[PDB]
Design a protein around this ligand. Structure first.
Ligand code: HEM
Ligand code: HEM
Ligand SMILES: *[C@@H]1O[C@H](CO)[C@@H](O[C@@H]2O[C@H](CO)[C@@H](O[C@@H]3O[C@H](CO)[C@@H](O)[C@H](O)[C@@H]3O)[C@H](O)[C@H]2NC(C)=O)[C@H](O)[C@H]1NC(C)=O
Ligand SMILES: Nc1nc(OCc2ccccc2)c2[nH]nnc2n1
Ligand SMILES: Nc1nc(OCc2ccccc2)c2[nH]nnc2n1
Ligand SMILES: *[C@@H]1O[C@H](CO)[C@@H](O)[C@H](O)[C@H]1NC(C)=O
Ligand SMILES: *[C@@H]1O[C@H](CO)[C@@H](O)[C@H](O)[C@H]1NC(C)=O
Ligand SMILES: *[C@@H]1O[C@H](CO)[C@@H](O)[C@H](O)[C@H]1NC(C)=O
Ligand SMILES: *[C@@H]1O[C@H](CO)[C@@H](O)[C@H](O)[C@H]1NC(C)=O
Ligand SMILES: *[C@@H]1O[C@H](CO)[C@@H](O)[C@H](O)[C@H]1NC(C)=O
Ligand SMILES: OC[C@H]1O[C@H](O)[C@@H](O)[C@@H](O)[C@@H]1O
Ligand SMILES: OC[C@H]1O[C@H](O)[C@@H](O)[C@@H](O)[C@@H]1O
Ligand SMILES: OC[C@H]1O[C@H](O)[C@@H](O)[C@@H](O)[C@@H]1O
Ligand SMILES: C[C@@H]1O[C@@H](O)[C@@H](O)[C@H](O)[C@@H]1O
Ligand SMILES: C[C@@H]1O[C@@H](O)[C@@H](O)[C@H](O)[C@@H]1O
Ligand SMILES: [Ca+2]
Ligand SMILES: [Ca+2]
Ligand SMILES: [Cl-]
Ligand SMILES: [Cl-]
Ligand SMILES: [Cl-]
Ligand SMILES: [Cl-]
Lengths: 466, 104, 465, 103
């Protein structure tokens, strides 16, 4: 059966059924399309079904370099010994590199605007064209690699391409680790959970399992609660940019043509820095642009991402709210009253009981984002525990963790501590004014902005080989 | 695994020397809790009509979404302490960490 | 295959090669046969290879009742409504039941005595005929179940076969649990680890994973260090019993003929009660009956059980000694001298290092049985941890644990606390003198023995509807 | 899994209601540690000639047995505080807990 078009429940389709009085889908014969994740062991009736991760779990910027040899190779420019990543040969962004185009059999980007005829981009990970905001980040990191590779070349003329690629890749990977652990995770977790789950690094521990845990692929979806219903584009004065400064998100999915034909990544990066995120609130969990209209422009019907999140946790055989609470060492509410206390919210607790009957059955995602946020973080205790635990394993269990002895020199580590996402944005775009640290906090222009000239660049001196 | 490397492999292979595939691509996720399926080993909850989970009817994913997640867009609350960039880095990071394949 | 007869390393064969100047096998082109364990996901290049458990992990006497529906029916006597287990139709043991014979395609028991033509037994687990001492224990439990069902029938005449079977099966399962956790484990782990890994039971916890851990199938093989090189058979006087009072172990493997034709289970059960176990010592680890001559009568060549243990741990992808130490929160010796401190035996440490180069590479079984024994236990810290951990999960994660509310009534629990292995032997054999509690400690007749009449029988009154 | 029951199933199925296969027969062992294979996922250490484990040659299982485990039978020390019945119950119990099938 074709899960894309059929509402018949037959492997591998697990379609979402429609309740009565649905606000959008009035036909109960209809459904929301859903393919079960691939089983790690097809057919088995001996093995408890598990799912597959196609990416390296390490924070190694595999979303830039790829996670498989053939692809990693294709992403590289091998016309010379400059160790560069391949860039688009058809279009440029005000003189700067864009991502190469991919060659998909069924290109969904082409569908978003028939006449424009712009295919999806090719990057380390297949989802780079999912939204233009994502594409701009991918494109930013590509530029930074080549920028790095060009500097290194100047320093070490004798270095061949292989050497230049690796050294630049090694740096980009550290930058990603640094931004993520220094700047990002503390604002996800809050200082308390930060201390608890990510105590001061010591060094590499070869007994720490670095694999992504199945539950993480659902819990880190908390991010969906942050999504604004518009893509926001601003000009060099940080004012609304024409044309169309506020596109409904349902018209940006897979819309690579907007990056290519509507002004590149500058207006999008500025939109990201100077527009606030959505705040997760117990009665304002996630917007209808993803709840009602996900991928509208490329699917027979609009998807509900939160619902998908919940169907996906069932597909993956994940235990309920309470089992995870227990796993994390958090109390497990049994009654509507007890749930009200955990949530500081009896109304929501009631609604949850009305849906689920028991806190034991609440889907991990739903339960996760229901909890009041930790101070100066954007998840509750449950998600902080799950997310915190994962990232510590990724850090302590990564032999190539940037602070790990022997990976970089002491001087290189000191130089690396100087990097920031704002600098990276200054060095690879036409943007000359950017967010103050912390870039994930700053969100009001011009209050939270500085001139690029005030920020020190990454100094690659200590990479000099005699 | 080579006795001595210098840079990550692409697939992640060999990061952990004792157990070379840990963190490598195209492997099974690790589990922190045993899986819970309708038949205990493969069928997802909600699969068979009338089959309860732990004493209660399974709620339709779409229905929970309708009843708990839905809100008027005009009520949206801007985060006074987070930029949209905070959202976007999360998605970019997610995409360094996991992708779960499904059938074409 | 054929793993039995080729030395080609071809899946699923993984034969053990022979070191130069081996003391037994002079043919350098020969080898010790070995079959890789069946993979949980055959073929896959995505899932890290893992292995399969054919049995229920729970302490539920599945070796008596079976772990699969069809077998469990075949084991039942269904000619009537008495809920009995099928017994042998061809032979009896001084008028007591013997295990039914099985119907194997390739039967090893037949090989141990050409003229006798006595086949392997049929039981809950397929290894019941592996040694007559094991066979005797199975048979013991077979009669006890029948004894209970029979006595339940008198108490409750209206109960049908299914009811009597289940009720008796439940009692037997509880006895195994009690003997194991009350009498056995404490003497394995020692009092310190008993408290650490098996604190006082509270009640069923449905978030405790009861599965057996891969490493456990290997670590619990510590038992191999306790094996004596003979089967001891004594008489009603507890004196050596003719014809053969001390049969070398390499002539009892699969020797079901000995049970049927050489006196039944009593002489074997008496030998177990009044003969000391072998003690594990760091220069006397396991005997050559199992190391040189295992299954000698039923294979082209004698196996080496300890070597098998080690090849099996590699087959199973089991991490080495140090990783397990670390798992258990125990210090991990990196050098020879450190390993010498941990073992309190420098010589042994140097031998191990000579063999492995690093304590990280010592196979779990080898390293485990190498540790000096815990006070009043018979394993070291590493094995106690692994073993202790496994049994806590089997207990706390067993919804049908005998002490769990709703399982038995209060008065039933009270009555079950009276059971003992000695009593079970008194109830199902012709032995009238048995070991003092604790049966696993007592080993000297007559110092450590009592009259059966002094042990109270299990009182079934509270099972009456 | 039935809503109410009274006795164990034969296979162990349903002992744990939330995850009804746990402790049931013919399922994968649980791992307490990631497995260690010559190739990371399948081949056993000692499989390929010359392939070292963690920087050292894999020791033939039979040699370790020869060099470490072997002793003169007449040196055997009987356990003054354990009966042979202590060995036997261990095997009997083992056989309640696990059997690992092979081809
Ligand atoms: C992490 C993460 C996943 C799972 C990755 C994996 O496959 O292992 C995830 C899932 C999805 C899905 C799949 C839904 C399904 O199960 O069928 C879609 C369609 C989607 C779309 C978008 N997401 Fe998401 N998501 C993960 C994390 C995040 C984060 C983390 C902070 C954010 C933010 C985010 C945002 C978006 C997004 C924005 C345009 C789209 C579209 N995702 N995700
Ligand atoms: C526990 C335990 C196992 C693992 C059982 C499983 O999961 O399959 C075990 C293994 C074996 C094997 C298999 C050898 C191989 O790996 O190829 C044999 C041939 C064997 C023989 C005997 N054993 Fe043993 N063993 C386990 C535990 C124990 C214990 C624990 C207290 C004792 C005692 C014991 C005794 C014997 C024995 C005595 C006659 C023979 C023969 N086994 N075992
Ligand atoms: C029933 O038994 C289980 C398991 O023995 C108990 O659950 C366990 O409780 C511990 C302690 O809270 C949990 O440890 C925690 O793990 C998290 C995640 O790694 C960590 O952040 C904490 O530091 C802490 O160590 C453990 O995860 C959890 N295990 C499971 C399977 O849920 C449970 O408490 C027991 N119930 C009762 C009433 O005793
Ligand atoms: N698993 C998954 N899926 C998505 O879209 C669907 C998608 C899959 C492959 C390529 C492009 C698009 C996501 N968007 N953001 N995270 C995503 N994760
Ligand atoms: N796994 C295993 N194997 C043995 O022998 C081999 C054997 C397998 C099947 C039936 C009879 C004999 C054992 N003997 N004691 N424990 C055993 N465990
Ligand atoms: C490879 O690099 C050279 C020099 O920068 C450039 O001219 C060429 O376009 C690059 N190729 C690709 C595919 O980007
Ligand atoms: C498609 O692209 C063309 C070229 O930029 C543009 O003029 C047109 O408006 C786009 N389509 C839509 C629906 O916007
Ligand atoms: C390495 O991590 C594991 C897993 O938490 C732990 O057993 C071990 O003690 C750690 N070692 C060190 C030195 O921290
Ligand atoms: C079943 O029980 C009856 C009565 O005890 C007995 O005579 C018969 O031999 C038994 N059958 C088997 C196969 O044990
Ligand atoms: C086989 O058993 C018979 C009894 O039937 C006995 O007389 C004979 O000695 C045994 N043979 C051997 C080789 O043990
Ligand atoms: O706090 C309970 C427990 O939760 C988690 C970890 O942070 C442990 O160190 C801590 O002991
Ligand atoms: O296994 C996941 C995780 O659970 C929690 C604690 O037990 C951690 O130490 C462990 O790492
Ligand atoms: O994982 C098995 C066993 O490992 C250790 C501890 O984390 C235990 O609480 C746990 O049950
Ligand atoms: C990542 C590490 O993993 C293990 C835990 O026991 C440690 O406490 C730490 O959490
Ligand atoms: C059996 C249980 O499993 C889990 C642990 O957190 C508990 O302490 C206990 O060991
Ligand atoms: Ca990665
Ligand atoms: Ca069992
Ligand atoms: Cl191109
Ligand atoms: Cl998980
Ligand atoms: Cl018969
Ligand atoms: Cl294990």
């Amino acid at each position: 059966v074709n899960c894309e078009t059929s509402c018949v429940q037959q492997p591998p389709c697990f379609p979402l059924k429609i309740p009565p009085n649905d606000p959008r889908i009035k036909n109960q014969a209809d459904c929301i399309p859903f393919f079960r994740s691939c089983p790690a062991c097809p057919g088995s009736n001996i093995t408890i079904r598990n799912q597959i991760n196609a990416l390296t779990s390490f924070v190694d910027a595999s979303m830039v370099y790829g996670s498989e040899e053939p692809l990693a190779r294709n992403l590289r420019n091998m016309s010379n010994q400059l160790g560069l990543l391949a860039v688009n040969q058809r279009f440029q962004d005000n003189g700067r590199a864009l991502l190469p185009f991919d060659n998909l059999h069924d290109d969904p980007c082409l569908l978003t605007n028939r006449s424009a005829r712009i295919p999806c981009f090719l990057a380390g990970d297949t989802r780079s064209s999912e939204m233009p905001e994502l594409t701009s980040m991918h494109t930013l990191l590509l530029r930074e690699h080549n920028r790095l590779a060009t500097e290194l070349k100047s320093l070490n003329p004798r270095w061949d391409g292989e050497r230049l690629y690796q050294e630049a890749r090694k740096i980009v990977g550290a930058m990603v680790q640094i931004i993520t652990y220094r700047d990002y995770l503390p604002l996800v977790l809050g200082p308390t959970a930060m201390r608890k789950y990510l105590p001061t690094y010591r060094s590499y521990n070869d007994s720490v399992d670095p694999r992504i845990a199945n539950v993480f692929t659902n819990a880190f979806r908390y991010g969906h609660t942050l999504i604004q219903p518009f893509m926001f584009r601003l000009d060099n004065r940080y004012q609304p940019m024409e044309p169309n400064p506020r596109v409904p998100l349902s018209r940006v999915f897979f819309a690579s043509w907007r990056v290519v034909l509507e002004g590149g990544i500058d207006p999008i990066l500025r939109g990201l820095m100077a527009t606030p995120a959505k705040l997760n609130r117990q009665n304002q969990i996630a917007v209808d642009e993803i709840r009602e209209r996900l991928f509208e422009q490329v699917m027979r019907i609009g998807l509900d991402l939160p619902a998908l999140n919940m169907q996906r946790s069932r597909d993956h055989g994940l235990p309920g709210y309470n089992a995870w609470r227990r796993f994390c060492g958090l109390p497990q509410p049994e009654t509507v009253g007890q749930l009200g206390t955990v949530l500081r919210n009896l109304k929501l607790a009631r609604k949850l009981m009305e849906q689920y009957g028991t806190p034991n059955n609440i889907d991990i995602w739903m339960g996760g984002v229901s909890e009041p946020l930790k101070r100066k973080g954007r998840v509750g205790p449950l998600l902080a525990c799950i997310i915190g635990t994962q990232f510590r394993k990724l850090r302590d269990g990564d032999r190539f963790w940037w602070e790990n002895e022997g990976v970089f020199s002491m001087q290189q580590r000191q130089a690396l501590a100087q990097i920031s996402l704002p600098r990276i944005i200054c060095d690879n775009t036409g943007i000359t004014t950017v967010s103050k640290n912390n870039i994930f906090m700053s969100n009001s222009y011009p209050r939270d902005f500085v001139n690029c000239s005030t920020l020190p660049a990454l100094n690659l001196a200590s990479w000099r080989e005699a | 695994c080579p006795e001595q490397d210098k840079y990550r492999t692409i697939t992640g292979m060999c990061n952990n020397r004792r157990s070379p595939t840990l963190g490598a691509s195209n492997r099974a996720f690790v589990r922190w809790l045993p899986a819970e399926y309708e038949d205990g080993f493969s069928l997802p909850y909600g699969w068979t009509p009338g089959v309860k989970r732990n004493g209660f009817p399974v709620a339709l994913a779409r229905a929970v979404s309708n009843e708990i997640v839905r809100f008027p867009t005009d009520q949206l609350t801007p985060d006074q302490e987070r930029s949209l960039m905070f959202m976007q880095w999360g998605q970019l990071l997610d995409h360094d960490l996991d992708f779960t394949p499904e059938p074409a």
